[PDB]
Structure 1
Amino acid sequence: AQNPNCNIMIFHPTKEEFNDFDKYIAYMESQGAHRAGLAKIIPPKEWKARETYDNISEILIATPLQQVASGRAGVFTQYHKKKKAMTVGEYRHLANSKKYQTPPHQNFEDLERKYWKNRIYNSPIYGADISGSLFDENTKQWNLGHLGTIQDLLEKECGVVIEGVNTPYLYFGMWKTTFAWHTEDMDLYSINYLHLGEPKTWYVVPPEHGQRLERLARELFPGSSRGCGAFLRHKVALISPTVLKENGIPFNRITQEAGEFMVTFPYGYHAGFNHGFNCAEAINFATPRWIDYGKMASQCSCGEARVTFSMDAFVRILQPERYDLWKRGQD
């Protein structure tokens, strides 16, 4: 069995290997990459996402989100308070202000220490979940707006044609902006490209051990667990590496820098934080290997998780017994 310790693997495809996206994912899996839940892909030196970022300041962040924490430093939830619209140029100036900027630090490890010590005492503002793309239309390789759709994959594998669309999302971050512990909708893959700015640190639990994280989360957030049988779908809970180690939960960590891709694999729980002002693009995708994970994915029916239009058909075809209850949650 390849990669039996479930380590995060890093890949350096050549420009020739960068042509065929599906083939390269399958290659990484042949080497055991999926066992970690997360892989890094460094693009060939010849490749670029677009010519420059000199012209992005006029993108609008219609609903910036202030991420307010509750709990203790290593075990907390966050809620999102909506703020007034601002441009990316306005948000970048805010990120660089004395109130929000990255503190002085020695290296990524010192910064990670400071994040876990101090995160709860601040409320950073995240420009998350903005429909759109920064890839040039002429970029032919690993262009996240030109990928094969999940609807087309389901049709190819299973024969059934369904409604729905699959488009990318932009994320503008600042110091301490946080993504809570989660898997993707319907336990899909994700791919994330860091277009510019400061790094993003990731934590990940191997898919074979995801239920150990779920059992810990039920213990640590006991009210939330009584409220919903899949409350990590709410994407509000944080647990630090120190607390995971104290509880014996297998995990790994890695830092993504500008110009690098990360892929998350079906049922790979992940969480993390941004080091300073940055911009990332991400989208969900599927392969043949996903279908069995989609059939078994948990679902929130309490009403909190509220998701996209396109998830209806996935539930309806892959999970017909759950469909009725899940849709009551959505309405």
Structure 2
Amino acid sequence: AQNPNCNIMIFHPTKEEFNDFDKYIAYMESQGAHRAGLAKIIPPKEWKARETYDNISEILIATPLQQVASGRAGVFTQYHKKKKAMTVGEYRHLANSKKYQTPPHQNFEDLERKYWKNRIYNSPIYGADISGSLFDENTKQWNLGHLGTIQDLLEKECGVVIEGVNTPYLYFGMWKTTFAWHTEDMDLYSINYLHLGEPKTWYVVPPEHGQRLERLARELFPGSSRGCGAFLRHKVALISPTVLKENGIPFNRITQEAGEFMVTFPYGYHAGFNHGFNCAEAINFATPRWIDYGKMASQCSCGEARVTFSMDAFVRILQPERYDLWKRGQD
């Protein structure tokens, strides 16, 4: 078995290897990359996403989200308070202000220590889930707006044609902006490109140990667990690496820098935070190996999760028994 310790692997494809996206994902898995739940891919030196990022300031963040924490430093939830719209130029200025800017720090480890010590005492503002893309239309390789769709994958694998579409999302972050412990909708893959700015630190639990994280989460957020059998779908719970270690949960960590791709694999729980002003682009995708994970995916039906139009068909076809109860939670 490849990668039995479930380490995060880092790949350096050549420009030739960077042509066929599906083939390279399959290659990474042949080397055991999926066992970690997360992989880093450093693009060929010849590749670029677009020419420059000099003209992005007029992009609108229609609904910036203030991430307000409750709990303890290492075990907390966050809720999202909607703020007034602002442009990316305005957001960047806010990120760099004295109130929100990254503090002085020695290295990534120092900054990580500061994050977990102090995160709950601040409420950073995130521009999340903004439909759009910053890939140049002429970028032919690993263009996240030109990937094969999940709907076509399901059709190729299972022979059923379904409605729905699959487009990328932009994320504008600042110091301490946080993504809660989660797997993707329908336990899909995700791919994330850090276009510009300061790093993003990731934590990940191997897919084969996901239920260990779930059990700890139920213990640490007992009211939430009573309210919903899949409350991590709400994407509001944070658990620090110190608390994971104290409870024997297997996990890994890695920091993503500008110009690098991360791939998360089916049922790989992940969480993390941004170091300072940045912009990432991400999208879900599928492979033939995903189908059985999709069938298995645990669903929120309490109504909190509330997801896209396109997930309907996934639940309808892969989880017909669950479909009635789940759809009630969306409508």
TM-score bracket relative to the smaller structure: over 0.9
Instruction: Measure, in 1, the Cα distance between the counterparts of 2:197 and 2:10.
Output: 21
**Helix, strand or coil at the partner of 1:212:** helix
Query: What is the aligned partner in structure 2 of residue 189 from structure 1?
Result: 189
TM-score normalised over the length of structure 1: 1.00
**Helix, strand or coil at the partner of 2:208:** helix
Instruction: Measure, in 2, the Cα distance between the counterparts of 1:194 and 1:279.
Output: 6
Instruction: Measure, in 1, the Cα distance between the counterparts of 2:106 and 2:130.
Output: 33
1:133, CA displacement in angstroms?
A: 0.1
1:233, CA displacement in angstroms?
A: 0.1
Quote the sequence identity (%): 100
Instruction: Measure, in 2, the Cα distance between the counterparts of 1:170 and 1:229.
Output: 30
Query: What is the aligned partner in structure 2 of residue 294 from structure 1?
Result: 294
1:51, CA displacement in angstroms?
A: 0.1
1:136, CA displacement in angstroms?
A: 0.1
1:254, CA displacement in angstroms?
A: 0.1
Instruction: Measure, in 1, the Cα distance between the counterparts of 2:143 and 2:305.
Output: 29
Instruction: Measure, in 2, the Cα distance between the counterparts of 1:128 and 1:304.
Output: 18
Instruction: Measure, in 2, the Cα distance between the counterparts of 1:198 and 1:328.
Output: 41
Which whole-Å deviations, capped at 9, do the CAs of 1:191-247 have from their partners, x for residues lacking one?
000000000000000000000000000000000000000000000000000000000
Query: What is the aligned partner in structure 1 of residue 15 from structure 2?
Result: 15
**Helix, strand or coil at the partner of 1:5:** coil
Residue ranges of structure 1 left out of the alignment (5+ in a row) = none
1:17, CA displacement in angstroms?
A: 0.1
**Helix, strand or coil at the partner of 2:165:** coil
Instruction: Measure, in 2, the Cα distance between the counterparts of 1:217 and 1:248.
Output: 13
Q: Report the number of matched residues.
A: 331
Which whole-Å deviations, capped at 9, do the CAs of 1:240-267 have from their partners, x for residues lacking one?
0000000000000000000000000000
Residue ranges of structure 2 left out of the alignment (5+ in a row) = none
**Helix, strand or coil at the partner of 1:190:** strand
Instruction: Measure, in 2, the Cα distance between the counterparts of 1:317 and 1:38.
Output: 27
Instruction: Measure, in 1, the Cα distance between the counterparts of 2:5 and 2:321.
Output: 36
1:50, CA displacement in angstroms?
A: 0.1
Deviating beyond 4 angstroms after TM superposition, the runs of 4 or more aligned structure 1 residues are none
**Helix, strand or coil at the partner of 1:110:** helix
Which whole-Å deviations, capped at 9, do the CAs of 1:273-322 have from their partners, x for residues lacking one?
00000000000000000000000000000000000000000000000000
Instruction: Measure, in 2, the Cα distance between the counterparts of 1:40 and 1:330.
Output: 34
Query: What is the aligned partner in structure 1 of residue 118 from structure 2?
Result: 118
**Helix, strand or coil at the partner of 1:300:** coil
**Helix, strand or coil at the partner of 2:10:** strand
Superposed, which structure 2 residues align to 1:11-160 within 5 Å?
11-160=11-160
Query: What is the aligned partner in structure 2 of residue 176 from structure 1?
Result: 176
Instruction: Measure, in 2, the Cα distance between the counterparts of 1:317 and 1:52.
Output: 42
Which whole-Å deviations, capped at 9, do the CAs of 1:145-171 have from their partners, x for residues lacking one?
000000000000000000000000000
Instruction: Measure, in 1, the Cα distance between the counterparts of 2:143 and 2:328.
Output: 36
Instruction: Measure, in 1, the Cα distance between the counterparts of 2:100 and 2:74.
Output: 21
Instruction: Measure, in 1, the Cα distance between the counterparts of 2:271 and 2:169.
Output: 17
Query: What is the aligned partner in structure 2 of residue 221 from structure 1?
Result: 221
**Helix, strand or coil at the partner of 1:78:** strand
TM-score normalised over the length of structure 2: 1.00
1:91, CA displacement in angstroms?
A: 0.1
Instruction: Measure, in 1, the Cα distance between the counterparts of 2:174 and 2:313.
Output: 35
Instruction: Measure, in 2, the Cα distance between the counterparts of 1:17 and 1:122.
Output: 43
1:121, CA displacement in angstroms?
A: 0.1
**Helix, strand or coil at the partner of 2:283:** strand
Instruction: Measure, in 2, the Cα distance between the counterparts of 1:78 and 1:182.
Output: 13
1:79, CA displacement in angstroms?
A: 0.1
1:6, CA displacement in angstroms?
A: 0.1
1:86, CA displacement in angstroms?
A: 0.1
1:138, CA displacement in angstroms?
A: 0.1
1:190, CA displacement in angstroms?
A: 0.0
**Helix, strand or coil at the partner of 1:162:** coil
**Helix, strand or coil at the partner of 2:245:** helix
Instruction: Measure, in 2, the Cα distance between the counterparts of 1:100 and 1:33.
Output: 36
**Helix, strand or coil at the partner of 2:94:** helix
**Helix, strand or coil at the partner of 2:123:** coil
Which whole-Å deviations, capped at 9, do the CAs of 1:20-52 have from their partners, x for residues lacking one?
000000000000000000000000000000000
Instruction: Measure, in 1, the Cα distance between the counterparts of 2:170 and 2:273.
Output: 15
1:4, CA displacement in angstroms?
A: 0.1
Instruction: Measure, in 1, the Cα distance between the counterparts of 2:137 and 2:296.
Output: 36
**Helix, strand or coil at the partner of 1:123:** coil
1:106, CA displacement in angstroms?
A: 0.3
Which whole-Å deviations, capped at 9, do the CAs of 1:94-125 have from their partners, x for residues lacking one?
00000000000000000000000000000000
**Helix, strand or coil at the partner of 1:312:** helix
